[PDB]
């Protein structure tokens, strides 16, 4: 009985652009669940985080706007969305997903979710 | 009685050391006020921060455990203490020298303010 919003990212060096992404995400519902990329997932995207996955998760968990934070699953965003059951998934201004592709992918799993692109912080 | 705790720092790049300092400081009272160093002060103490003072302050304000955050005074700590009027001032575990120095200031003036060193972070 609440609108659950899922946001994602690496969150290596926290900065106000993150805060903008997370607050705009929280506004859309009641609960904000943040999925923090695994170090392996981050490397496979050509980033080696300065802070390890456990440290990045713990810091994100300390933010007022974050209700729950969990680690992602290496290789398997399908499973995260199945386990979180968001009503809404938010995409950062620069995140590399096509809203259409993501939607059809999620619909093939028999899940209905609203996908929203968040603005760049200025 | 609502105990006011004052913590201080630059908080340039947030990390779990900062979180342990802030979180343990909050545990000691009811309101945590964080005093964030101005860019001139940090520079003058030989630590150039990469994030500007307004950014650092704004990010610190987003932490669950922080009730209020303010910019410090350009080179005059006792002026901050006189304005914030904390019940407790929190220092890092390593800072016994700063502790003794602050204690002499307190004692000469005869104000009621308790200094507490926070436990060493792991
Ligand atoms: N400057 C910014 N403006 C808006 N959103 C941002 C900014 N910086 C990071 N984000 C978002 O925060 C999430 C995590 O970014 P990252 O830690 O770079 O993976 C992604 O959705 C980003 O688009």
Curated annotation (Swiss-Prot), chains A, B:
Listed GO MF terms: ATP binding; FMN adenylyltransferase activity
Source taxon at top rank: Archaea
Catalytic function, reaction form: FMN + ATP + H(+) = FAD + diphosphate
Pathway the protein acts in: Cofactor biosynthesis; FAD biosynthesis; FAD from FMN: step 1/1
Binding site residues for ATP: 10-11, 15-18, 94, 121
Disulfide bonds: none
Cofactor: a divalent metal cation
Catalytic EC class: transferase
UniProt keyword annotations, A-Z: ATP-binding, FAD, Flavoprotein, FMN, Nucleotide-binding, Nucleotidyltransferase, Transferase
EC numbers: 2.7.7.2
Function statement: Catalyzes the transfer of the AMP portion of ATP to flavin mononucleotide (FMN) to produce flavin adenine dinucleotide (FAD) coenzyme.
Subunit structure: Homodimer.
Name listed for the protein in its UniProt record: FAD synthase
Taxonomic source organism: Thermoplasma volcanium (strain ATCC 51530 / DSM 4299 / JCM 9571 / NBRC 15438 / GSS1)
Gene: ribL
